[PDB]
Structure formats: C-alpha cells, structure tokens
Amino acid sequence: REHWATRLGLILAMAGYAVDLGNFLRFPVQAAENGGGAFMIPYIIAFLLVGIPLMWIEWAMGRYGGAQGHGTTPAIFYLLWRNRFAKILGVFGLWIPLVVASYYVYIESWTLGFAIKFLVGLVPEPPTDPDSILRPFKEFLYSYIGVPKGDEPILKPSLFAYIVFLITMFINVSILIRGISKGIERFAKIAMPTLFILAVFLVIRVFLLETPNGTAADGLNFLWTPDFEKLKDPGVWIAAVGQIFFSLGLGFGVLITFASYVRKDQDIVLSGLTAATLNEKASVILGGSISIPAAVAFFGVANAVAIAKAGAFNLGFITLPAIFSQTAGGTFLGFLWFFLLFFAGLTSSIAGMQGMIAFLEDELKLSRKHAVLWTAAIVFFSAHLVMFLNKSLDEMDFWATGIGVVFFGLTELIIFFWIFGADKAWEEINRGGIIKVPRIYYYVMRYITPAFLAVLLVVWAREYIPKHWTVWITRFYIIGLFLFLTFLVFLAERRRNHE
Ligand SMILES: COCCCC/C(=N/OCCN)c1ccc(C(F)(F)F)cc1
Ligand code: NA
Ligand code: NA
C-alpha cells in the first residue's frame, strides 16, 4: 500500500483539500450575513464541538482501515460494524464525492479558462454606473457557461469552455496517475506555497484599493464589525455549524481515504489539528481580506449588504472581475485571482477523486493507471449532465452536500463511536499521537457532536423536505450512480470469496 512520504506534505495535502473557493468566497459571505465579527462566536464553538472532534474521527477511521488495506467506507464501515447494512451505508461515502466531482471539476475549469482569458487580455472592457460595469461581465460569464436565453433548460457552453474542461481533467489525471507521494503530496508541496503567495499579494493589493466610493478599510470594517443581535437567531448557529462541515470538508469521505495512507502508528491527532487550523487561518486572514473588502472599496459600504446578498458566486465571477477591469493593471489581477482559485480547487479535486481511485485499487485490485483512467472516465461522462442541463448542477449539490454533511457525517459518528465502541474508538484516535486528545472531548464526540449533527439534520430536514420536471433527470442519474456503486461493492465481496 502507498504512503505519505513526509509529515509536512501530509498536512499540506490535507490542508490542500480543505482550502478551496469556499475559504475566499463562501465563508466571507456567511460571516457578513450572520453578525459579521459576532459570527466568530458560534463559528469557533462549532469548530470546537463539531469540526475538530469529527476531523479526528475521519482520520482515525482512515488509518484504522488503511492498516488493513482498505481506504474507503464500504470496507471500513464493515470493519467497524460487521453487517450488510454497513456495506450499503458505506457506498454513500463513495457516492458523495463522486457526485461532487461531476460538477466540482467543471467549475474548477472555469477559473482556469477565465485565468487564461484574463492573462491574454480576452476580457470585457467597460464602459459610470454599477450596472453598466457588471453587465459586460455578467454576460461574459453567461457566454462561457452557456446560460439559457430561452425557456429551455438547456446550457450551451463555449467550445473553449469545453476544451478547458478537457484540459482541467487532464491536469487532474496527470497529478493523480503519479500516485499519493510523487503526485498529490509532491504537488501539495508546490501548490500550497504558491497559493499562500498569491493570497498575500492579493491581500496587499486590495488594502491599497482606493476609490471615490470607499477604501479597503471600510471593507474590513463592514465585514468585521460585530452585530451581536444576530446571535439570537438559531439560523446563524445553524449556518455556523454547516459552514464548519463545508470549511473542513467533513462528510465527503475524502479525509478517510487520505488518512488511510497514514501508517499504523503515525500521529493523526496533532497532524489533523494542524491542517485544520491552516484552513481556518486561510479563511479568516486571507479569504476575508480580499473579496469583500475589494467589493466594498469599489462600490462603497452603502452597497455592502446588497453585495453580500448577491451570493458568493456573483462576488467572485462577476463582481470582482468587473472591479478588476477598472483598477490599474487589473487584467493581471484578474489572472492572479482566477489562478489563485484554480489551484485552490485543483488541490481539492485531486483529493476527492482519490476515493474512487482507492476503491478500484483496494477492492477491485485495479492498477493505479486503470483506477485513475476509469475514475476520470466516470467523472468526465457524468459532467456532461452538469455542462448541458440547466440547474442539474444545483440538484447534484443539494443532494451530495445535503446528504453528505447532514446524514453521512452523523453516520460516521455512530458507526465508529457508538457501534464500534467508544473506548476502542478513543484509543484508535490517540494511538501514536504526538499529543493526546483532551479528556473532555470524549463527551463531545459521544454526545455533543452527534447531538449537533442531529439538529443540523432535522432543521435541514424540516425546511428542505417540503422544498421543475427536469430535476428528475439529475435524480435519475445520481440514483443510477448509487446502484452502480452498490454493484461494484457487490462484485468486490464476491471476488474476495473466490480468493
Ligand atoms: C459546495 O461545493 C462543494 C463542496 C463539497 C465538499 C468539498 N470540500 O473541499 C474542500 C473543503 N472546503 C469537496 C468535496 C469533494 C470534492 C471533489 F470534487 F474532489 F470530489 C471537492 C470539494
Ligand atoms: Na475550507
Ligand atoms: Na484545495
């Protein structure tokens, strides 16, 4: 079985996964909409009562399974719980990242394409007024994606956008086919520094942004000025818990696959706590210092609420590009921004697609080449649904991330900490650990963490269970994916009986 070479690279790859577009875009929006600086109160608590405990568990399950030559949840759940229902629930952790990858890699290709178009100067040039600046870029994005003009739910992406997607896939395969250490870990040692440099530079250039409408100081002002009156809203505490899941990448079975390449007695306590902190630092220090400030600096603090309500996607694919076409040398700033984003996603997309690569290796005994080429084949095929069918992207995100963070994460708790046994579990986490997990966390892992995860589920349940016909096309496919994966798991246990 393959293994991580260095402890540094391990943390960088785990952080590589955790840090992506959400750190720079999603997180700053959630904070401003939910109390600003006051949002740091429930966010840190959730980091301590949910994020950190659950992180350690996925690291534990991974290493525990990796020592037995299994990196995925269909096998691992069957090791924590000798049952048929454990193998089925395990498929979900093979299904979730595979669904995300069907849309995630494609959006990752957008950043790359934009980065290319921005670098060569193939971008709109306005013209005055805010809608006169945004519209040439709103339309720039819509022509790349192929946003439907008529009533049809049909997208028509550009040939270029399609070609960049093919290139993005090829890049992923390039890194992935070289393996854990010589591919992912090697690239994680190059990307993360390159990422940090790009962030710092953008942070610096943004703080220098001065327009007649405002400054960057007004941006960091609006974003971080605490509104404690919003702490009364349960929805703020719900968003915070949800944000931590999203921030750390919990409930997608990605960590579990990675940790399974960590050796039997190597530390997972301190190593995890490090990679987790790197992401949080990247979010609060770098991510919340670029997007929102630059948005407020150009449009003023008067539109700061409107900007945050416009969503994270508009902020990063329309708003910020439009601001860049108005600043000195902003076309290169557009390129550094989209190249910052491209790497952030790429370090995540190679991480997520590994689970399916691991399965084909560990359970179906496929070579690494075949495992990558078929995984690439599957994600490439399924992506055509995202590329051509309008709102298919949303349906996949809803089901994958929805079930992923709200169902499957809780399942990891119960199986490992309630079915497999809390004491046996606790030893598996602390074993070989440089530092030991605080004795208080035993109660947080066993009660507090699943109690929260139950509530996040239920509130999510009570709102989304009640909440067009073409959505069935996407549902039809992703269900077909689950059946397909059940079948592979089925074939996996039948090959093992023969040998
Ligand atoms: C809402 O956008 C999708 C996020 C799902 C979780 C995500 N975490 O990555 C870094 C944490 N912020 C993720 C999961 C799977 C994949 C992959 F596409 F690689 F499977 C990529 C990102
Ligand atoms: Na993150
Ligand atoms: Na990443």
Side-chain angles (χ1 to χ4, degrees), residues 262-263 265-279:
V262 172
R263 299 181 181 269
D265 293 325
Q266 184 176 340
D267 165 85
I268 63 177
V269 180
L270 180 61
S271 308
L273 182 58
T274 305
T277 316
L278 285 176
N279 165 79

Side-chain angles (χ1 to χ4, degrees), residues 168-263 265-388:
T168 302
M169 277 296 307
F170 174 75
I171 294 175
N172 280 256
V173 178
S174 305
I175 300 174
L176 281 175
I177 202 174
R178 279 163 172 74
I180 296 295
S181 59
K182 299 177 174 299
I184 296 182
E185 185 178 349
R186 179 178 178 272
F187 181 82
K189 286 184 174 183
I190 306 181
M192 298 301 288
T194 309
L195 214 52
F196 177 72
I197 293 176
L198 287 167
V200 172
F201 184 86
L202 291 182
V203 165
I204 266 146
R205 209 246 181 264
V206 161
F207 288 172
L208 303 176
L209 277 184
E210 285 185 318
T211 66
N213 293 324
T215 56
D218 312 342
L220 298 176
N221 189 90
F222 159 80
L223 178 61
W224 295 114
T225 36
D227 182 29
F228 298 99
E229 195 80 323
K230 295 214 65 178
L231 289 185
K232 302 183 176 183
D233 197 343
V236 170
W237 290 83
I238 264 61
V241 174
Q243 180 54 38
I244 264 301
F245 247 101
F246 267 125
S247 181
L248 301 178
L250 302 166
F252 299 87
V254 177
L255 288 177
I256 309 205
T257 314
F258 266 9
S260 62
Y261 298 103
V262 172
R263 299 181 181 269
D265 293 325
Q266 184 176 340
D267 165 85
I268 63 177
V269 180
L270 180 61
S271 308
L273 182 58
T274 305
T277 316
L278 285 176
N279 165 79
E280 302 305 311
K281 288 175 180 171
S283 298
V284 304
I285 300 304
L286 307 174
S289 305
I290 305 178
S291 49
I292 296 298
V296 175
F298 194 94
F299 293 102
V301 81
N303 306 272
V305 175
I307 291 181
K309 280 184 177 294
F313 180 77
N314 275 27
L315 181 67
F317 287 83
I318 301 175
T319 300
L320 254 64
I323 294 180
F324 289 156
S325 67
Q326 303 292 110
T327 62
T331 223
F332 185 77
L333 247 276
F335 162 76
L336 289 185
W337 169 247
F338 288 112
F339 177 59
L340 170 69
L341 289 193
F342 171 62
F343 263 17
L346 180 54
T347 50
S348 291
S349 72
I350 60 173
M353 282 190 296
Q354 182 58 32
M356 186 50 186
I357 298 171
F359 174 84
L360 297 177
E361 292 170 344
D362 303 344
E363 325 294 342
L364 292 184
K365 305 307 176 178
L366 264 56
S367 72
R368 190 171 66 239
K369 172 174 68 177
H370 294 161
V372 173
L373 291 183
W374 281 108
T375 292
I378 291 181
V379 178
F380 178 75
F381 183 87
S382 317
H384 281 62
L385 210 59
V386 174
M387 298 192 293
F388 288 90

Side-chain angles (χ1 to χ4, degrees), residues 10-154:
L10 167 63
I11 304 182
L12 286 179
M14 289 281 196
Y17 164 66
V19 186
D20 72 334
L21 291 79
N23 296 63
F24 301 98
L25 291 170
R26 195 179 197 273
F27 165 79
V29 171
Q30 300 292 337
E33 287 198 356
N34 302 277
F39 179 74
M40 286 301 103
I41 298 298
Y43 181 78
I44 292 171
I45 292 178
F47 180 73
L48 293 170
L49 296 185
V50 173
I52 293 295
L54 251 188
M55 172 217 31
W56 276 329
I57 297 189
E58 293 187 20
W59 275 69
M61 296 187 281
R63 181 181 64 181
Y64 173 76
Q68 308 181 50
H70 299 310
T72 56
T73 57
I76 289 180
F77 287 2
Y78 187 69
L79 300 179
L80 303 176
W81 194 14
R82 281 230 160 186
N83 192 322
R84 182 147 297 277
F85 193 62
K87 285 188 177 182
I88 303 180
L89 287 188
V91 172
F92 268 103
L94 197 56
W95 182 75
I96 297 157
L98 200 56
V99 174
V100 175
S102 289
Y103 68 91
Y104 194 88
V105 171
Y106 179 57
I107 293 180
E108 164 179 317
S109 73
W110 301 356
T111 65
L112 182 63
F114 272 63
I116 297 176
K117 302 281 286 303
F118 261 92
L119 181 58
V120 302
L122 285 175
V123 289
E125 299 174 17
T128 316
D129 287 336
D131 202 34
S132 181
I133 306 179
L134 295 178
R135 189 170 60 252
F137 282 89
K138 190 173 188 179
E139 291 170 345
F140 176 76
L141 175 56
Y142 285 20
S143 293
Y144 195 84
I145 310 309
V147 180
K149 298 161 250 55
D151 300 27
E152 310 279 50
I154 288 306

Side-chain angles (χ1 to χ4, degrees), residues 354-426:
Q354 182 58 32
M356 186 50 186
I357 298 171
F359 174 84
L360 297 177
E361 292 170 344
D362 303 344
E363 325 294 342
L364 292 184
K365 305 307 176 178
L366 264 56
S367 72
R368 190 171 66 239
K369 172 174 68 177
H370 294 161
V372 173
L373 291 183
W374 281 108
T375 292
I378 291 181
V379 178
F380 178 75
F381 183 87
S382 317
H384 281 62
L385 210 59
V386 174
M387 298 192 293
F388 288 90
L389 181 61
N390 186 26
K391 296 299 178 191
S392 175
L393 184 157
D394 306 74
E395 191 67 19
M396 289 189 181
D397 171 272
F398 170 82
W399 291 111
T401 69
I403 301 184
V405 315
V406 135
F407 283 77
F408 192 80
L410 176 59
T411 302
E412 292 170 342
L413 268 165
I414 307 177
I415 290 184
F416 189 70
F417 221 72
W418 272 101
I419 289 179
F420 179 76
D423 291 20
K424 300 172 56 61
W426 180 266

